[PDB]
Amino acid sequence: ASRLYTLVLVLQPQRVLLGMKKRGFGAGRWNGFGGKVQEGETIEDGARRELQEESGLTVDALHKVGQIVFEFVGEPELMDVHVFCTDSIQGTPVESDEMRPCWFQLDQIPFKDMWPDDSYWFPLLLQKKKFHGYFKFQGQDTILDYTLREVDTV
Numbered sequence: 528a529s530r531l532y533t534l535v536l537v538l539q540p541q542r543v544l545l546g547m548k549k550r551g552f553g554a555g556r557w558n559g560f561g562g563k564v565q566e567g568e569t570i571e572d573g574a575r576r577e578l579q580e581e582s583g584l585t586v587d588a589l590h591k592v593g594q595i596v597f598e599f600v601g602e603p604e605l606m607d608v609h610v611f612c613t614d615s616i617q618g619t620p621v622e623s624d625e626m627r628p629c630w631f632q633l634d635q636i637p638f639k640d641m642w643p644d645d646s647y648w649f650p651l652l653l654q655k656k657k658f659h660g661y662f663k664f665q666g667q668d669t670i671l672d673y674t675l676r677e678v679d680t681v
């Protein structure tokens with residue numbers, strides 16, 4: 528089976544917001560905000576909730592931009608990540624226990640300190656293209672298989 532997750536990228540014309548994960552799963556890597564969808568909330572609800580929790584930020588509209596399925600070898604549940612983006616945010620991002628936020632110019636995205644799959648699908652994000660992705664990981668650094676396609680409906 529699969530578990531739903533969310534990922535929220537605040538993409539502004541000349542910069543993208545990322546957070547350095549301070550503890551837990553994926554510590555020491557920059558990434559968007561997000562996490563597990565809870566029982567009782569929509570996916571979009573959970574994306575807004577984790578955005579608020581990890582950065583203090585609220586948004587008016589999130590747009591569906593991607594879906595990436597992850598398999599980790601030896602882990603039974605696939606991770607079904609729904610990727611959202613927004614330009615217009617509400618508030619100034621602040622550090623949480625989980626995330627230290629920072630803006631990045633679009634030409635200085637810290638790919639070598641991000642999840643490896645980001646190098647593959649982030650360009651599609653920056654092109655405002657919608658995508659389906661699949662990545663199979665051995666551990667947390669090695670991509671063994673992957674597929675990536677642009678779609679019409681996420």
Ligand SMILES: CCc1c(NC)nc(N)nc1N1CCCCC1
Nearest residue numbers: 532533534558561562597642644
């Ligand atoms: C491990 C799954 C994952 C990943 N795969 C390697 N790549 C990125 N950029 N984000 C991920 N998530 C986003 C949701 C919350 C958990 C971490």
